[PDB]
Amino acid sequence: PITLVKDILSKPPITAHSNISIMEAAKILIKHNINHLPIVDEHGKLVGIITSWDIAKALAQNKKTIEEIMTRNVITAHEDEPVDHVAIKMSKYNISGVPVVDDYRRVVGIVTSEDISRLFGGKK
Amino acid sequence: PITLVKDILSKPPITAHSNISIMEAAKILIKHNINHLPIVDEHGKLVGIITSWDIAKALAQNKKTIEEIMTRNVITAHEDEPVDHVAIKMSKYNISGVPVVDDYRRVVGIVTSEDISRLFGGKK
Ligand SMILES: C[S@@+](CC[C@H](N)C(=O)[O-])C[C@H]1O[C@@H](n2cnc3c(N)ncnc32)[C@H](O)[C@@H]1O
Ligand SMILES: C[S@@+](CC[C@H](N)C(=O)[O-])C[C@H]1O[C@@H](n2cnc3c(N)ncnc32)[C@H](O)[C@@H]1O
């Protein structure tokens, strides 16, 4: 069959607003055992993404805020997207996770390289 | 065919000793655009692993040293190991990368979930 994003995505999505501190973002990553944190506006629409790597960058380069360190051009997926299209996308942009969004940029889940790697292993 | 670790692994491995600071570890992750840092002893043998998530944990929980935060029971792979065995391993232990070691625990490379996800996408 063709596996789609909606078959493997993690939900509900864990998200945050851009006004939390870097320490607060780190705490969310640890609490939920995740490496990806989509940043959303007051209407729940995607404005950026924070990963563990960005938290490491903040330490390495003396960065101060989430707004300063978040990636604003976020590569995303749709729930009907074939998982292999997403894998190719992540490889092309050298990234490790993609928020799943609806047509109005609301976050409905996330697919990471760990989810796709898991799929690879259970297919065998 | 059967794809093996040696067909897809990243080398040379980027490693560090346990006596570097947390900031210094973060700097290595940023410099090399990676999320995994195998920690090795003076003979190059694996003693632990640091990831971006651990750097985030250090901030979240006021941790002080690499020795304090590194994971010591490291799940590893061999170069002749089928990539799908590795994917299953990473899923089982909920981890995102595995150092590739020889029979005497010397680090010869690393395979991450991004490498396996890439493999998934190019297979289509
Ligand atoms: C370009 S990657 C390279 C290092 C490694 N391959 C990784 O994925 O972390 C590092 C940057 O990817 C960004 N990133 C992660 N997921 C993203 C996404 N879905 N869209 C855009 N950027 C993303 C992070 O914010 C981080 O600044
Ligand atoms: C259990 S994972 C769960 C969160 C997420 N799945 C991830 O991979 O980061 C978090 C821990 O995995 C540990 N880890 C990463 N790679 C590892 C490996 N090859 N062997 C043992 N532990 C590893 C990291 O040191 C970190 O403390």
Ligand SMILES: CSC[C@H]1O[C@@H](n2cnc3c(N)ncnc32)[C@H](O)[C@@H]1O
């Ligand atoms: C970030 S890697 C941790 C695993 O948990 C899930 N995950 C990652 N980030 C989030 C998030 N922001 N919200 C919910 N689940 C997530 C992903 O599907 C991944 O396989």
Ligand SMILES: CSC[C@H]1O[C@@H](n2cnc3c(N)ncnc32)[C@H](O)[C@@H]1O
């Ligand atoms: C950590 S995810 C970044 C990518 O670069 C490679 N990489 C990760 N960690 C290391 C490392 N310690 N040394 C060399 N390459 C690495 C991995 O194969 C991965 O696909």
